[PDB]
Write a protein that binds this DNA or RNA. Structure first.
Ligand SMILES: [Mg+2]
Ligand SMILES: [Mg+2]
Ligand SMILES: [Mg+2]
Length: 803
RNA sequence: UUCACAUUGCCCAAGUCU
RNA sequence: AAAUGUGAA
């Protein structure tokens, strides 16, 4: 449960394709560098402040310590130098003055880059973490000064263009930068990015922006509260400057002319007229209470400016979002070009600090050979038992019938949309079309709905469903029409999934008024699965050898609360295959600690899923394939430490000695590796993306470990994110080819569409489950209550309610 | 709430002071 | 999931 397995071999399957990766080769010297630990009192100050302190420090003490040695600083307690310092390691305390600080400089170690060169070969067997860290600190020293660091990215005011979002917000552009070891050479991962920022404008113009004013006046009216309430919500927590900066903690109720503070008591507009000799042009407008809520101070809006690129955590409005989308949307070629020209303009080789450490960065994207894996054949049923052949990640169901289609005899229709908008004629025609498409697909809706009744409000949901369950024997499904976005949906799912155990299929009103064969088809894809039907299976003879023995496939995912929240739970979801196809899955879901990635209650979930697998197949899995979504590198060791063991436990407590082999695969969809077609005649579609099946396990992958990029999806828009798969454990000793082919084929078993999805079907179902859980908890966000809300009905346990 | 793909929001990362 | 856009038998 400790070390990830070494890469067994390289993939051989599929035709080759010339690709370019946004990785940039790094020439690293084979010389020692020097680590130094720093201590700065006080330490409660921000990272950038510490950077400033160290900069001033290096400047001042050039003649007795530093001097022509150009150190790098990680913003905390680490400083690296190329050539050594006058250190014994006799610790020297320095006193620094910043427009008042005590600094401790003590030597720690000599980071060997030669050992890193060894490790990159197979000559060392482990990759030195601290060394990679050092190189990273070096690469991001200068841009941490010149730009605004956000995570591993840097953003800045666009050179004379602007991109306003409204509300005092504008688009800032920038780039993610990272240092990664690879099979070949150190790599600088660079990718273009963009995000929202508050314009460094006067607070007055911010008010104009926020309250939709053309300009103040209209008016000199000391606002409403709708103005005061909204403006206060917008500016609170944001920094404002006058030389002196402050954090806005409140907005006064009284105008500057009247707002009073104890000096005897005095008013703001008067105090600024006496001590500061200024006369307010806009006195009627309120004041900003800055600093501590505790105590007082009050600054007029007219003498305050926003600061200096403050990332705007708050959520973007619908219109702002639309603007951002419109601004940052680009095709794969356009993305590629933007990244390239970014790397040209950046000119890393002239950076004095990377120059100090003898580091070279190639200004060209790395050339890498990919392999385009062959898609599996999708076997259908009915009389024909037709075979669909995925072409560029896509196929369809025309003239195909479900492998096992559910015969719908008893069903109901509940419309919560106003009858004026959704008429019985609309329902009738929609029903006719649906019955036709469903008949074609092999899912015969053989009757008219035994029930059809309009209703309104969430309060009407439970009684209506309770009637339906009690009135119609053998009721298979209730189709619910909804008037757009409504709190009724979450309710329907609450009653259906957790309260009554009834199959419900919702459809927006607009998709009833105007039906199309495609929409209806996909809808049937959902309905059939929801009623226990097998849409289609992988061609049994086209599957990898692993299927010769009974094997279970587990999807696993954790979904965390949105940015800003601090009390909502994280949600764990684990699904498990219930046949040899593999097609049917069952779900398990838990609530757990806020922002905990490690699946706390995993063993129980795996036990449930194994039990259900046995009851479904009468087989005990000899192999457990575990697709774990969302775990970053920095968390691998832990997660595998807890989760892998949790699986073993789950087996151990089930039967001794039941020890099926475990393959633990971390799925990463969200990273900064982008692959582009080298040949223009290879780009697919309008977005010009790499074709589905594109597999990369060389050159840019891990120097010693079992990992691979596999873009399994047809890129419709923008630049495809190739899913990265990292194998943390593998008792079954998969070869690269078998595991990659298996993953790719699994990407074709996703029931909700006749396409090849970007991640394996089980992990996707895991996502859907976690999200449905989040739906059951809406407005319900101690432990026992949330857990209760998240627990499905006994008749829903063994279904695919999440489809 | 037909569906996938993209951008954002989600562990690690970052951010936090006078 | 949600906002926003591209798409589809
Ligand atoms: Mg997740
Ligand atoms: Mg953290
Ligand atoms: Mg959408």
């Amino acid at each position: 449960a400790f070390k990830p397995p070494p890469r067994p071999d390289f993939g051989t399957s599929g035709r080759t394709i010339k690709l370019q990766a946004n990785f940039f080769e790094m020439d690293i010297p084979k010389i020692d560098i020097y680590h130094y630990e720093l201590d700065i009192k006080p330490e409660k100050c921000p990272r950038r402040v510490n950077r400033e302190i160290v900069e001033h420090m290096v400047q001042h003490f050039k003649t007795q310590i530093f001097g022509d040695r150009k150190p790098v600083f990680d913003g905390r307690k680490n400083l690296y130098t190329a050539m050594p310092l006058p250190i014994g390691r006799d610790k020297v305390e320095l006193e620094v003055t910043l427009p008042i600080f005590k600094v401790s400089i003590k030597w720690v170690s000599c980071v060997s880059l030669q050992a890193l060169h060894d490790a990159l070969s197979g000559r060392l067997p482990s990759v030195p973490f601290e060394t990679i860290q050092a190189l990273d600190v070096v690469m991001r020293h200068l841009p941490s000064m010149r730009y605004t660091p956000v995570g591993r990215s840097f953003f800045t005011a666009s050179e004379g263009c602007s991109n306003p979002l409204g509300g005092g917000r504008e688009v800032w552009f920038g780039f993610h930068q990272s240092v990664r070891p690879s099979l070949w050479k150190m790599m600088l991962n660079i990718d273009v990015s963009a995000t929202a920022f508050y314009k460094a404008q006067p607070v007055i113009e911010f008010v104009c922006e926020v309250l939709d004013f053309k300009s103040i006046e209209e008016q000199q009216k000391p606002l409403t509260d709708s103005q005061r309430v909204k403006f206060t919500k917008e500016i609170k927590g944001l920094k404002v400057e006058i030389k002196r900066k402050y954090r806005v903690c409140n907005v006064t109720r009284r105008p500057a002319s009247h707002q009073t503070f104890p000096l005897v008591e005095c008013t703001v507009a008067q105090y600024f007229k006496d001590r500061h000799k200024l006369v307010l042009r806009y006195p009627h407008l309120p004041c900003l209470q800055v600093g501590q809520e505790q105590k007082h101070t009050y600054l007029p809006l007219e003498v305050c400016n926003i600061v200096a690129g403050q990332r705007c955590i708050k959520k973007l409005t619908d219109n702002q979002t639309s603007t951002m989308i419109r601004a940052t949307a680009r095709s794969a070629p356009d993305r590629q070009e933007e990244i390239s020209k970014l790397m040209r303009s950046a000119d890393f080789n002239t950076d004095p600090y990377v120059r100090e450490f003898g580091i070279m960065v190639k200004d060209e994207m790395t050339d890498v050979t990919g392999r385009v894996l062959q898609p599996p054949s999708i076997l259908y049923g009915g009389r024909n038992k037709a075979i669909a052949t995925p072409v560029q990640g896509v196929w369809d169901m025309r003239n195909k019938q479900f492998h096992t289609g559910i015969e719908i005899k008893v069903w109901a229709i509940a419309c919560f949309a106003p009858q004026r908008q959704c008429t019985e004629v609309h329902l009738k025609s929609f029903t006719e079309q649906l019955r036709k498409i469903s008949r074609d697909a092999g899912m015969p809706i053989q009757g008219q709905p035994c029930f059809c009744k309009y209703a309104q409000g969430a309060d009407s949901v439970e009684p209506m469903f309770r009637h339906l369950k009690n009135t119609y024997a053998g009721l298979q499904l209730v189709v619910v029409i909804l008037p757009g976005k409504t709190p009724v949906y979450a309710e329907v799912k609450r009653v259906g999934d957790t309260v009554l155990g009834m199959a419900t299929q919702c459809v927006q009103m607009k998709n009833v008024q105007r039906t199309t064969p495609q929409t209806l088809s996909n809808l049937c894809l959902k309905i059939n699965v929801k009623l226990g039907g097998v849409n289609n299976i992988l061609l049994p003879q086209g599957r990898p050898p692993v299927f010769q023995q009974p094997v279970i496939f587990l999807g696993a995912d954790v979904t965390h609360p949105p940015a800003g929240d601090g009390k909502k739970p994280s949600i764990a979801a684990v699904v498990g295959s219930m046949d040899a196809h593999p097609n049917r899955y069952c779900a398990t879901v838990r609530v757990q600690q806020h922002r905990q990635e490690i699946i706390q209650d995993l063993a129980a979930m795996v036990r449930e899923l194994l039990i259900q697998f046995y009851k479904s197949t009468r087989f005990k899995p000899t192999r457990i394939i575990f697709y774990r979504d969302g775990v970053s590198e920095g968390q691998f060791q832990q997660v595998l430490h807890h989760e892998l063991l949790a699986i073993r436990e789950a087996c151990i407590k089930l039967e001794k000695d039941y020890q099926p082999g475990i393959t633990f695969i971390v799925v990463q969809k969200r990273h900064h590796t982008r692959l582009f077609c080298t040949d223009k005649n290879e780009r697919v579609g309008k977005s010009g993306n790499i074709p589905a099946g594109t597999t990369v396990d060389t050159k840019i992958t891990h120097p010693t470990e079992f990992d691979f990029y596999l873009c399994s999806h047809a890129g419709i828009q923008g630049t495809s994110r190739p899913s990265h798969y990292h194998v943390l454990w593998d008792d079954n000793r998969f070869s690269s080819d078998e595991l990659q082919i298996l993953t790719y084929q699994l990407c074709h078993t996703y029931v909700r569409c006749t396409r090849s999805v970007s991640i394996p079907a089980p992990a996707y179902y895991a996502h859907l489950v976690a999200f449905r859980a989040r739906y059951h908890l809406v407005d319900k966000e101690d432990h026992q209550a949330l857990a209760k809300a998240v627990q499905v009905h006994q008749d829903t346990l063994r279904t695919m309610y999440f489809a």
